[PDB]
């Protein structure tokens, strides 16, 4: 559907720029300070995710209702995947590189009160190291995450979504073979990377549970949620936890 050297050019050109959390690293870390900063980081990243998705070819040809649905449900996965890439490129996946001014070591993972989820996210980052994911594969795979979760009743124009998603799957397939392999080695690589994408979903589901817990207790825990974060978490996350969405896997 779209030439392989062109696709990578478009994806590189629209890739969001670095965003800082704005965290005061001179302060002592508390659960509330770290979680509020992550909430603030998510709001800042979410603004870039919308601008990014709008520039993804074919996305804005969806009905605006479906565009809302896709961003509302997939923003967690897109951000966690990009975070794993950042940790791979910056600290060789030894720490969680949420932002240049918000890097989690073991101490911050403990005081965040989601230590086990942080460990799971570092394991995801380590898969980048073991697989030696290219930047070209990363960009194609991240684009696919916009097409990873849909309502159980489907979208307004499900058929167009189906073909656009199939298209972006083909783009990943073509990028892998574009890089010199035999067809056997390219077929294994496609399975590895799609299995990597599917491994995101259990992590994302736990993160959706965790963020709804924080939101419910935000006042008592002194954990602040920015405005757009609150609008999505108070609307689409409950539907996710109610089983009203389905992940679109590969394996």
């Amino acid at each position: 559907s779209n030439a392989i050297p062109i696709f990578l050019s478009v994806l590189q050109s629209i890739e969001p720029e670095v965003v800082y959390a704005g965290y005061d690293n001179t302060q002592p870390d508390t659960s509330a300070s770290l979680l509020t900063s992550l909430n603030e980081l998510g709001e800042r990243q979410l603004v870039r995710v919308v601008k990014w998705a709008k520039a993804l070819p074919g996305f804005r040809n969806l009905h605006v209702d479906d565009q809302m649905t896709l961003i509302q449900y997939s923003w967690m996965g897109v951000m966690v995947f990009a975070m794993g890439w950042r940790s791979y490129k910056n600290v060789n996946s030894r720490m969680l590189y949420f932002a240049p001014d918000l890097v989690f070591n073991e101490q911050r993972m403990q005081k965040s009160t989601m230590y086990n989820l942080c460990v799971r996210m570092r394991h995801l980052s380590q898969e980048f190291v073991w697989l030696q994911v290219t930047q070209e594969e990363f960009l194609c795979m991240k684009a696919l995450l916009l097409f990873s979760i849909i309502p159980v009743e489907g979208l307004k124009n499900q058929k167009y979504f189906d073909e656009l998603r199939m298209n972006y799957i083909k783009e990943l397939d073509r990028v892998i073979s574009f890089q010199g392999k035999n067809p056997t080695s390219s077929s294994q690589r496609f399975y590895q990377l799609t299995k990597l994408l599917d491994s995101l979903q259990p992590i994302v589901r736990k993160l959706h549970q965790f963020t709804f817990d924080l939101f419910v207790q935000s006042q008592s825990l002194s954990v602040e949620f920015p405005e757009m974060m609150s609008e999505i978490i108070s609307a689409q996350v409950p539907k996710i936890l109610a089983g009203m969405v389905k992940p679109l896997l590969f394996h």
């Binding site: 919308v50 601008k51 605006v64 809302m68 961003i71 405005e227 757009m228 609008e231």
Partner: peptide, 9 residues
């Protein structure tokens, strides 16, 4: 609103 505001820009 808000997410819709960003998409309509």
């Amino acid at each position: 609103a808000l997410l819709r505001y960003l998409l309509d820009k």
